From a paper:
Interestingly, only the tetramer assembly of USP25 gave rise to single crystals. Initial diffraction of the USP25 crystals was poor, never beyond 6 Å resolution; however, after conducting a lysine methylation protocol, diffraction was notably improved, and thus finally collecting a 3.28 Å resolution dataset. The crystals belonged to the I422 space group, and contained one molecule per asymmetric unit. The USP25 structure was solved by SAD using mercurial derivatives, three of which were located bound to three cysteine residues (one corresponding to the active site cysteine). The structure of USP25 reveals the presence of a homotetramer quaternary assembly composed by the interaction of four different USP25 molecules from the crystal lattice. PISA server analysis also predicts that the tetramer structure of USP25 (A4), with a buried surface area of 23,730 Å2, is formed by the assembly of two homodimers (2 × A2). Each homodimer composing the USP25 tetramer is comprised by an extended contact interface that includes approximately half of the LCC coiled-coil domain, forming a four-helix bundle motif, which would act as a dimerization hub between two USP-like catalytic domains, resembling a “pair of cherries” with the knot at the end of their stems. The LCC-IL-loop insertion domain also participates in the tetramer interface, but in contrast to the dimer, the interaction occurs with the catalytic domain of the opposite dimer. Two contact areas can be distinguished in the tetramer interface: between the extended IL-loop which is deeply inserted into the S1 ubiquitin-binding surface of the catalytic domain (c in green and Supplementary Figure 4c); and between the LCC1 “kink” motif with residues from the loop connecting β9–β10 strands of the catalytic domain.
USP25 shows activity in hydrolyzing K48- and K63-linked polyubiquitin chains and is a target for different post-translational modifications including phosphorylation, SUMOylation, and ubiquitination. Human USP25 is a modular protein composed by three domains: an NTD (Met1 to Tyr159), a central USP-like domain (Asp160 to Glu714), and a CTD (Lys715 to Arg1055). Strikingly, the USP25 structure displays a homotetramer quaternary assembly and the catalytic domain can be divided in three differentiated subdomains: a general palm-like catalytic domain (USP-like), a long coiled-coil (LCC), and an “inhibitory loop” (IL-loop or IL). In our USP25 structure, each IL-loop inserts into the catalytic domain from another molecule of the tetramer, thus preventing substrate binding and thereby impairing USP25 activity.
Author numbering:
A (entry chain A), B (entry chain A), C (entry chain A), D (entry chain A): 159 to 204, 215 to 255, 261 to 345, 355 to 470, 516 to 670, 678 to 708
């Protein structure tokens, strides 16, 4: 019973009161290096639980870098935003934790207002600004606004793009609105709300559709720059979707054919008709070591007529049927093929609509995925985070930080597969490569003298416990 | 908080360590009046936990008759057979409880061996004797044996008779065995073992087939008296079952027709063929307030050709098809009918095989059903018991004895429906009407002076608690 | 090959060009006696295919009464309304056939305009008049109108009443409309349109919901007389339906419980939890003739721990769980019961809403049901008709008129069960008992001298063919 | 209407009386070059329909090589083996067609018995010899025998190897038998019999299990050479299969857990228990533009208690449950993982058992696959054949020879997917590369002078029809 790091790995967090949402959200910010620098180069500049929190955060980050031991107890910092709702959501606890930083980095960026007016390095990372072409009542309206995480809703949609286009267009002398981005943050986050009313049940629940999202997300379609072209693509998309719907309907009828309540493939009914016509006729079905030549069939049953076959049939009734059906069967076997082939193409076309230079210009690496299993109020949470340097997806589940994969991530995050599902996606701008994923070079020993001390004391303190482990063999 | 009987109802039992199997089995014996007399007319005659048990049983029966309060704590008596396995099944606990009585009623029937040799009134009720026509190895063998509850196994069978015939015949210079009853007990019990190995799983589990049993059971087929006729019926049964199997196979083919992996009703394939032939032809399906007269149809769609229809067709291709199919359809529509009708009859015949005078002569009332929900070692148990006098099925679940029904009973007991299922059936001989269901007449006050006292003391003691309930309003 | 009537049964019709809709609709009018009298007491009074049709109809009715032979060829009469669309629906063919009669009985009721103005005995039977409380635009509007068959639409509804209420109320400064009957015909017909668009498919198809209808239909709720009370019931109905919806939602959650995508009965999860807690603990599951006493169980497996069981458990962890779950299980087992019981009651209440004297006063016998299997343009049709006198449902399928049942009728007519389904219901007023189902008494030989002759000639002509059948044995 | 070859492609066959089995089997032999040489270098050497057949075969092969036109009418040759059953199977028609060749190549190999005794070049290709270690009755027996196509049966098996091992071992003082190959043909064929009795139905039908087979088949395990090692592997295989069965059983219980008839994943029951315990308590459930911060959730419902939650709960009932379940859940979540992981490994191990040098030494290219859709007597047939030179799978369906793929082939041949399924597999020895797939080099014009003439005449004759096609524009 003495378990430390392993070859200087990443360190997890023992979360304390099933408040895992913390470890999830922290580990995401911690692995975003620029923000980690910001938190370590912060001192209290000279709601005021604000500042002792960020001190203990500073202390926990320090620990997360230069501890020798497997995990840390962040409860020191948690306890702070915990009692801060006394005198009660899970997504308010965080909303405050972001206010605290937003406000606290405003405070320490106000040390150079000696010759100046404000500018906030946290708000520089997360927030951006989108324009709103709102033709809201007869007359046109055009509001540009600030935005944090863009919230997206998930019901119905297959992929993220689908899920986003539709989340940015509302309505449409007919009122209406459409968004476009003006300025993206470098650290772009999305919310995926799966909550929806369940009429069968009483109340609103998590939807469970699979919703898939890319490792690389190209945002260029969603901006004023390409406002003109996008809008033109979007028509063609719709007019195509419209088309395949007709093909899909017209296909369904081949596949699911019949006037009755149970319906079968037309292919199969024609095939099975001719089988019965071609069946050897009958009148009374209510009372009763060998060497094989190359292309032969052993075991082929005797051709004794039975079961259902027709009672009689002309030679010139048969060969009419055989002409008619065996022709039609092929008329279907192809029409089906052509309808599937027609659709595949139209799908392909829609896939590629936004796919070349000019529209492959604003790429984003998926950095972190926050996933949640369980009920609305009470869940478990955890996170997937890209290593970047080692270039591998890492799964941060409270104490335990495992090397993971995209394939694994997918099973948890997309939904449908497990009970779990993703709720925050966190993308970072590829172009802003090192504004976020740099390591300020000069040439544990990478920390301010404040923290470098504490972390080393607390190392040594934990070291003694190991001297005491092999000294406790005798 | 003071709840007594209601209009002198039946009284339940607070079972103590999820040992409900007790309340179940006791309440069954208690409601069997003759046995209840026996237990009340027993005094210790002059493994010897045997006797103080039966004293406390005597005391609990007394209570069950003449208490004024809703239930009794039988733990006094339970505790006795509980520690009796120290120095561990649930179906050994009972096996001992029956030994105790069997042995203890032998003891007090040995008070009149002054001029005599033995005879046991308990063993007179439960036990009977069956003969064994065993042609076990070349030569014939014929063993008559005593039997308690006949154990039956349940896998596969629909009804109890099926479940019993097959449980009494084993095998068949070929070895073999068959049982017949010689002497039935008046109080005939059956075990229904649902345990069987589950190859998919590891280990043996409860089967869940529905298995149904009658309110009145006629045993005459199962005896030496009718040995000759039964054996003759059993042939005809088999030779009929054999027959309907052919009808059922030959039917299946009409219903589930096709050479492929998915197969459909022949009726429907012929119907849907003619629909397609009769469909209005087409060449290019891969690229594109009113008064109503009596028998009209509004809303009948326009006849515009579409979707799948054939590319061309002669007038004399059509009317060949129409002749051929519309004929065959009717050839099937009838063959089906005749095959179903043939089967119904054969079923009927088998139902009635053992159904008239000479074979309606040994009837048994289902008296009690013991049912069990839950796993093999740990369950819940309860019982259904016929009132006889009030003539209503009563559901005895530990503390709570509710007026119930045959329909309800059926849902718990038969299996398939709920998780629960019956494991003991307890039938009583109709002819032996009052040897069991009498009430020895003379003309609470129906009990020996011993018990009449205790029960009345303990009444009064419980009465004071009620004086203390309305006296505790102030 | 000579097949005549059987004991003077009813006679069918060999329909000629899969125009069965004729035999269906005719046999319905023929069995409605008053209308049959009308057609036989019609002579051409002195679109003029009108009159030679009705002559051949007169001749076919005559035949249907007094033929000795099994069926008749009505093609003489069919041919007439057939070519009448040359110079093309199936429900126009009939619409004309009704115009012809409607107009032709107007012609022969105009023989007593010598001292008078019109009155039409056909129109007297079929047609009625309904009022329209239409609050159509701000201001109120109130139109009474004539009506033939009331057309009803079927999607969604369970029973006919449901299917009718909703068919008589449209909408609802908000526009709206509601119908009530003013004057019912004695011979009240309804259309059941099952056609609806099928978005999955291309085009509109037959719906297949089961829709049930009564043998006796009480119309009183649907009239101005009870306009006040009905409207009051309809509120209470709605406010109850509203209520049970809440009960049904709140029930669903007990039955289909879980945060995940697959959800199970809460009962079962609690039951299966306690089974696992109560399972005998284990640490390493990834690498490895007897007399039976009455209430015992043979074959109960050994209790060897295995498979999944927990790794460890306190005695005071167990009995907390056992207290908590075994309590909750019962809290659910009852809540479920109470919710089902609550619903049953509310259903009952709604069933009886319109059920006593004052609302059991306008009864209608279902006289005939017209059913149709097959596609929109091309079907098969047939009819069920109540005998009244013999008091038995008769199934008229082209040539073949069989004794049938309500149970059989139900399978064809209601939908869901077979491919077939009913499209016209024909009810008759119970009170107008003999205006329709009389037989004008005086005391084959029940026909005018015209027809009595022809029918007897044509009898004799058919008789000779039978003299020629036993004379053709030699 | 004049359609010839396309860029000198392969030529199909218009089969004549739904006798496609011919085109199938011929095109397979034709594309096997050595056999094609044999048939072209055959002249009648000097049942005697034998020889004029092979003349017309010679003529049809000639045509298949050097025709300019799209297909050929082989009916000349078919007609010959057709009437040869007059004075009636489909797999006798072929059995004769192979006898004819077998016998006819014996005849023309008997032209060099001037100094010799026999040797047959056809029989050299197809036939081989297998040994039979038969311990048939107490004493051992050892028969080596000739064999043509090895017939395999398909029920149950997944892959061909499985399907073959089991087809070569029969039984096992206990009788028994096992085969091993002694001498393989270079052109090794297998039969896949899918016919089996269908007890539910009447009679034997095609099974539809997917059965998969490789493009490259390594036969070394199936021979006397490796008799010793194979037998040793086969034990270890069995003892492993035995093992995973235990793992699979022990897994099933985690996944499909419950005492009742419906059973659910243990994971899910524990998860859903804790959800309900953790549900916010309740007493009466039978009667009643914003900027979002980064990691927040909008739309999270209010926490108002409802529906099912428990009636009450201690703080120290809760945290016992939470300890107990949240622990156990993880105990399962891992045990599952370990059991799946254990199995994957054991599967892998079995896959590789026969997989390295010494057992990768006798490789066979799948050359041709013959597939058949339809009923036992009446089917459609077609073939897939590897090009070798162009190195692409070609689908030969009567007239129409299309460029195809392994992926496509798989859909037709393996079964389960379509109605069709493969019945002959034809493998060729990789090592015997050119004994079969050579082209005897020297340096249409590749044919004897006999055939070179006819084929060119018949070319020119067909050429005139094209002069007549553009000359028939005017």
């Amino acid at each position: 019973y003495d378990r430390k790091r392993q070859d200087k790995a990443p360190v997890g967090l023992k979360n304390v009161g099933n408040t895992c949402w913390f470890s999830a959200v922290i580990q995401s910010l911690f692995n975003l290096l620029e923000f980690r620098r910001l938190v370590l180069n912060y001192k209290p500049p000279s709601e005021h639980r604000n500042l002792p929190f960020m001190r203990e955060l500073r202390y926990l980050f320090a620990l997360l870098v230069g501890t020798k031991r497997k995990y840390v107890d962040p409860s020191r910092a948690v306890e702070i935003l915990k009692d801060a709702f006394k005198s009660q959501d899970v997504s308010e606890f965080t909303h405050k934790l972001l206010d605290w930083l937003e406000d606290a980095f405003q405070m320490k960026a106000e040390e150079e207002t000696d010759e100046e007016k404000p500018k906030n390095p946290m708000v520089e990372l997360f927030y951006g600004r989108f324009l709103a072409v709102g033709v809201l009542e007869g007359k046109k309206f055009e509001n540009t606004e600030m935005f944090g995480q863009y919230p997206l809703q998930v019901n119905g949609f297959k992929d993220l793009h689908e899920c986003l286009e539709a989340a940015m267009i509302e309505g449409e002398g007919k009122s209406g609105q459409e968004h476009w981005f003006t300025e993206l943050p470098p650290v772009l986050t999305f919310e995926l709300s799966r909550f929806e009313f369940n009429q069968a049940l009483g109340r609103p629940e998590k939807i469970h559709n699979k919703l898939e999202f890319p490792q690389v997300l190209y945002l260029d379609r969603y901006m004023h720059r390409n406002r003109e072209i996008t809008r033109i693509k979007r028509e063609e998309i719709k007019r195509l979707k419209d088309y395949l719907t007709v093909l899909q309907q017209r296909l369904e009828r081949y596949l699911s054919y019949g006037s009755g309540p149970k319906r079968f493939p037309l292919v199969d009914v024609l095939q099975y008709a001719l089988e019965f016509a071609s069946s050897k006729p009958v009148c009374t079905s209510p009372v009763d070591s060998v060497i094989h030549k190359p292309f032969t069939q052993s075991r082929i049953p005797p051709d004794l007529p039975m079961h259902p076959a027709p009672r009689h049939i002309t030679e010139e009734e048969l060969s009419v049927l055989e002409s008619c059906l065996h022709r039609w069967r092929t008329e279907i076997e192809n029409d089906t093929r052509d309808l599937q082939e027609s659709i595949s193409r139209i799908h392909r076309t829609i896939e590629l609509m936004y796919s070349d230079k000019s529209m492959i210009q604003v790429p984003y690496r998926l950095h972190a995925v926050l996933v949640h299993e369980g009920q609305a109020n009470a869940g478990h949470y955890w996170a997937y985070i890209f290593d970047h340097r080692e270039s591998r997806w890492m799964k941060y589940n409270d104490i335990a930080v495992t090397k993971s994969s995209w394939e694994e991530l997918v099973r948890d995050s997309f939904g449908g597969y497990r009970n779990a599902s993703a709720y925050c996606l966190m993308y970072i701008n590829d172009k802003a490569q090192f504004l976020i994923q740099e390591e300020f070079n000069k040439e544990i020993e990478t920390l301010p003298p404040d923290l470098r001390d504490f972390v080393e004391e607390d190392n040594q303190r934990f070291e003694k416990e190991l001297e005491e482990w092999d000294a406790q063999l005798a």
